[PDB]
Enzyme design. Structure first.
Site, PDB file in Angstrom:
ATOM      1  N   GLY A 284     -48.956  14.774  -5.973  1.00  0.00           N
ATOM      2  CA  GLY A 284     -48.893  16.174  -5.614  1.00  0.00           C
ATOM      3  C   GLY A 284     -47.457  16.658  -5.635  1.00  0.00           C
TER       4      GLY A 284
ATOM      5  CB  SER B 189     -45.218   9.522  -6.633  1.00  0.00           C
ATOM      6  OG  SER B 189     -45.974  10.616  -7.115  1.00  0.00           O
ATOM      7  CG  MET B 190     -46.439  13.665  -2.035  1.00  0.00           C
ATOM      8  SD  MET B 190     -44.647  13.619  -1.870  1.00  0.00           S
ATOM      9  CE  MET B 190     -44.473  12.769  -0.307  1.00  0.00           C
TER      10      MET B 190
ATOM     11  CG  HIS C 237     -43.692   8.196 -10.173  1.00  0.00           C
ATOM     12  ND1 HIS C 237     -43.167   9.459 -10.010  1.00  0.00           N
ATOM     13  CD2 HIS C 237     -45.036   8.333 -10.072  1.00  0.00           C
ATOM     14  CE1 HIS C 237     -44.148  10.321  -9.818  1.00  0.00           C
ATOM     15  NE2 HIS C 237     -45.292   9.664  -9.852  1.00  0.00           N
TER      16      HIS C 237
ATOM     17  CG  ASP D 292     -45.257   5.933 -13.688  1.00  0.00           C
ATOM     18  OD1 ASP D 292     -45.468   6.442 -14.809  1.00  0.00           O
ATOM     19  OD2 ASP D 292     -45.064   6.607 -12.654  1.00  0.00           O
TER      20      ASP D 292
END
Lengths: 192, 177, 192, 192, 192, 192, 192, 192, 172
Positions: free
Chosen positions: F68, F97-98, F122, F171
């Site tokens: 997000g 990630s988030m 990432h 990633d």
């Protein structure tokens, strides 16, 4: 949501209606936007219910419409003519061909308009694509429709049939006093 | 009735209590202990999710709901009793077996219960939600029933030496002289 | 929302219905827009419920439709024929091929129309794309459908089968008096 | 809204249901439009609930469908076969390949159709794009599906497997009497 | 609305539930359409609630899915493994890769399927666009996912890991008896 | 509707909640789909309410998110840090990630994950189009954001800042045991 | 639905509110997404109601917005200035030009921000297409708007007008401590 | 949902209204976005209801609009003029041509604006495509509309007709003090 | 409340209510008289209102089952102008005897009677406001003149309409 709710105290109180249902309870109906099948059918249902409620009290149809399909307007007009109570049409904003027709179709002596309202009338529009024979059939049909509309307008306004025919050849706009003089409406509402 | 708690308010704060005759009772030398089952529902209530929470906060919330702040303020302490562990269950079984042995000796019947029989009784009766009370019923049915039959219309009429031992094929009990 | 609510006092009072449910309570059903599967199925459900309510009282189907798929119309027609109470079809606005058929399929003596309503009838439309054999199959199927429609129309209107065949070759429009004379409707509703 | 509400008086009265829930209360289920995953799952849920209500009373599945995916139809068919009460399928409007299959899959002696209903059957459709090996796998799978469908149809109609195979090679339409003679339905509903 | 309501009489009676809530009350859960984040999370919430209701009674997950994202399926599978009560998966309609995996992941001895249900399994799909290094990272990740899926399938079906690897190289369809013999399901539900 | 309702008996009984409200009552919050402004604000509101309910009991945030916007995630993270009760983050499905950041931001000793869950981290993404000066401004801003994210991750995982910097360059996927060893989560949930 | 409901026990208990209404009851308002006419009008209505509730208690406006139209922001700002109670603006997530302006417009001494929140300010954007004279008119209008915004920012932050003018020439991002030093906010919220 | 609910204690207490209905109860109406048929009709319904409630108490119309169609604005203006109670228009945010007109049309002495509100006025826009005769008709109609608008503005502001004509030739923006001096509003609201 | 309806139905069925102390309430000699309005400022462009249907509104709880207990349904209609004049005359002769018992003759002009009937009667409120209007318009100045002592025995008052003030002009 977009339509606000209101509160009314009659028997138990706190009777929550949407604003449109709250006004329908007062025998007033709104006609807005284009005249199409579903909206006109909704208007017809409301008129039938209001007739079943009290066949003696008038029904007020606030008209603000840029026109619509001729058939749905004819349905509304026939419903207005059939029901026993009188239908008082009030043109606020503006009323185009179908809207103007439904406005002038109100109960005689009860067709009103607002001082800055606009009224426009014209011959019905339409068309068709196909073979020559079907083209001719549809053309004769729309000409019969135009003749019937002119007859009904001449009946409701008191003007001569030739007068309506020569007037609605093109788009003709009418202010509130012009509409009163033409016979579409009976008087202009000014103040309480 | 929660209205009754105000009498305890007066007593706990002043150690005195005035009856209908204007007579004052002296509570200064009386230990006041009150036992409740409040707040237990939440502590044993299962939360919904992958991880369960300590509902002791809910136990405190419930107790505060039931007891007005000044009532909780006039207490020496609120001792939160815990559940009974398995070794505690073994000790409880020993206690109840000793009491049963006393009951039998009143009738003149000595009784010996093996160690693995005790372990099996504890394993059969252990119920975390109900504490120590299920052990009474377990010992009752597993021992008193054959013992009652033998004391009424059996071998143990004016005699003892009843031995109870556990097998491993059927987890059953031995009996008899 | 768009559909206003109404209030009715029968047993406890303040019975809030939408306008369409309020009219369905009076054994009147609306048929608008194109005839499709879901709308026709809704009409069928309403008719079945109304039959279960009182198999003796008539059911009024207010028809205003530009047509639709022949199969859904056939479902509605079969439901009308099967149920015991009489179905009074009232054509307001306009009724095209499927709508006109469902209108003329009402209970004999109870097919009405409004003075300015329009009625149009024509042979069923369709088509198919694919191999020659499937083309022939679909063509024979649609021809059987057309024959069945002509037979049912000749039955319900009293006209000869050849008359219906030569009439519905092209789009044929009918006014309210033309429809009465043709036999599609029994009479024209004028006033209360 | 679009679906009208109705009132029923059983214990406290004024029990407001939507029309579909009001009919589901009478152990009647509607199957309309294409057969897809969610709609078929809804039908399965309704059938399971109706079985749990009274495993002895019949269940009526009013079928009007232009087809759908074979898998959802197979789910519905398996649910019909599994449940104890008898499922009476009534084909109104029309029933295509999957709809016709679910119609003929009703309880023996209770497969009905309406006099103007249409029934069409054909081999299942499908396809795939990709490598030759996956193409072959999917082709063999769809051929197994076609064979299973033919076997089930031959079982439920009493026709020979070769008869079903030679009949469903192309789209084959059947009227109500043709369907009765073919064995898809048991009788035609005419009147009350 | 589209989902009908039902009535249940337990304590005060007239307990109106939607049909899905009415069945969830009976510890039965539906899994339909593609497996995505929100739907799988809804399934997880339902399973957690059902566990909190009675950790001893079984939970029935009616599976009809054409697949979905591997991660949401993994969430559902982990939730099924974690909870104490047994999850009985019933495959009706069809169950593709993720659906088939969630089906075979049911409680041992309680994985059922319906006689005409279809089961398909294949290696997971995916992809990525970008730089060569990120391509390699994503490829190794999806290969680890494929290996984990094969290990879990070999565990739940009893087949050898090499057998699952050579079987799921391409789309492999299985009928109900083929699925029973393969070990994906325990038995086929036939009748009450 | 799509979200089923449930029944709970606490004081008067028959307390009907949606499933999500029923779980929020148990101090468990779901985070699914992309992290955006409105969803993150909803999560913040739920966390504030749960804190006001009992500031001592833990809050469980079930995380399943493909990422997000960084700002909404920062809002959620700041809300988690500010409130007094401990927030136990459980990563089921997957957390990008988030999502991974919000997972590792849970209360120390209470960051869990499921055995088949996936974790990916990432450097933050973004971009801008315009004049060179605005480009430089936005680039410096996103670099500050990346530095702050790396600092927070190094704080919450215990890894060195240079380690996080060299790890999140591309990633990087992590299984459940890899995540436990890396320090993102404290332990893996296996069974009841 | 998507917004969960909560339960509150004040007078009769079991007062079910949505979470946003439950927080509005605590005199806290959320501002998220772009600032537009309807959302800003909703905020204004909430602020007016909260003022009518208790003109002495503060109002907390949680701001997380990427900007919006200048006019709606001006409406919100004027409503904040007009009402008697103090409006405490808390910037969580991020606050762009209009959001940052509404944040710094809070009651002096009560403008807070969260430690990782981001603040960005810039000159207002706009444009117009048409004739040269209308272009000049719109340009002068937007320049007046920019001047008014700079004056209000210089008033609320204490910085010089020339300082604001030279700062907001381009997008300027500010962290929480940078915002505190700049004067946009009064302090940073850290913990309970 | 998006619109929060509020609680009011008058007779039985816990009267849950949406915020807009809660303010309509206080005889305050909002006008936002473009002026179109349905929104203007909603405003008219609200004004009629408020008049029926108490024809002596003022009605407050909070105006924030970028304009709209002239006809709907004329409907609103006529409704404002007709009703007995005074309509106090408050321009917050901004009010363009139709919005500015409806603002200046408030009760004399009760037209307010907020210190940072913006007011813009211009000649009405429109157009038409078709034959030369219809072009001329529509042009004369729109010129009559423009003349009527100028007359009404000169009446309500006290300026000369030539002054309004030379002012509204192009887009003319006005600040709050400029609007007060021009006569559009009576005073500027500053503080409680 | 519908439970009141159930009790009333009990009575109408057997005419015996049981006191909670065991006493019997015998209704055999009690005539049961119940009233109902079922009536109704016209939102919109008019002020029209006249309607009656009480059978539907009591058929609510006085269902046909309940209505089968009714001995008669007595209908009342609006008051005509002549009968509102006649009830005004009734009130006027009542006040007249009241005053004559003290020695003061009172005459109300005919147009004043019509004005009193027009101000006191309302169709939506019946003859109920008439009591207050009659009292206020008549007794008030008479009360003043009598208590002050200026109007005493041998005095009288002639009520006439002030055509332009609408006040009831009077005299000694």
């Amino acid at each position: 949501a977009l339509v606000p709710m209101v509160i009314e105290q009659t028997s138990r109180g706190e009777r929550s209606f949407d604003i449109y249902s709250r006004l329908l309870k007062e025998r007033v109906i709104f006609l807005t936007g284009q005249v199409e099948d579903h909206m006109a059918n909704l208007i017809v249902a409301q008129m039938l219910f209001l007739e079943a409620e009290n066949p003696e009290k008038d029904i007020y149809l606030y008209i603000n419409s840029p026109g619509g399909v001729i058939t749905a307007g004819m349905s509304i007009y026939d419903t207005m003519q059939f029901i026993k109570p009188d239908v008082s049409t009030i043109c606020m904003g503006q009323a185009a061909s179908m809207g103007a027709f439904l406005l002038t179709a109100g109960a005689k002596g009860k067709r009103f308009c607002l001082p800055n309202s606009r009224v426009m009338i014209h011959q019905p529009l339409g068309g068709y694509q196909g073979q020559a024979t079907d083209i001719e059939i549809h053309a004769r049909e729309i000409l019969k429709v135009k003749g019937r509309m002119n007859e009904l307008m001449a009946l409701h306004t008191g003007q001569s049939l030739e007068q309506i025919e020569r007037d609605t050849e093109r788009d003709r706009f009418l202010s509130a006093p012009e509409a009163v003089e033409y016979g579409l409406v009976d008087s202009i509402l000014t103040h309480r | 009735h929660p209205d009754v708690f105000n009498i305890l308010l007066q007593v706990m704060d002043n150690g005195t209590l005035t009856d209908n005759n204007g007579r004052k009772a002296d509570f200064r030398n009386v230990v006041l202990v009150m036992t409740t089952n409040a707040g237990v529902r939440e502590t044993e209530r299962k939360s919904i999710g992958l991880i369960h929470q300590d509902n002791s906060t809910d136990a405190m919330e419930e107790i505060k709901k039931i007891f007005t702040p000044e009532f909780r303020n006039r207490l020496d302490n609120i001792i939160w009793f815990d559940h009974l562990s398995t070794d505690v269950i073994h000790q409880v079984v020993d206690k109840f077996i000793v009491e049963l042995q006393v009951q039998l000796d009143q009738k003149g019947v000595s009784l010996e219960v093996s160690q693995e029989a005790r372990n099996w009784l504890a394993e059969k009766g252990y119920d975390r939600a109900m504490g120590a009370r299920p052990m009474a019923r377990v010992i009752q049915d597993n021992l008193k029933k054959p013992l009652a039959n033998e004391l009424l219309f059996g071998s143990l009429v004016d005699g003892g030496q009843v031995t109870v031992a556990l097998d491993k094929e059927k987890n059953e009990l031995t009996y008899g002289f």
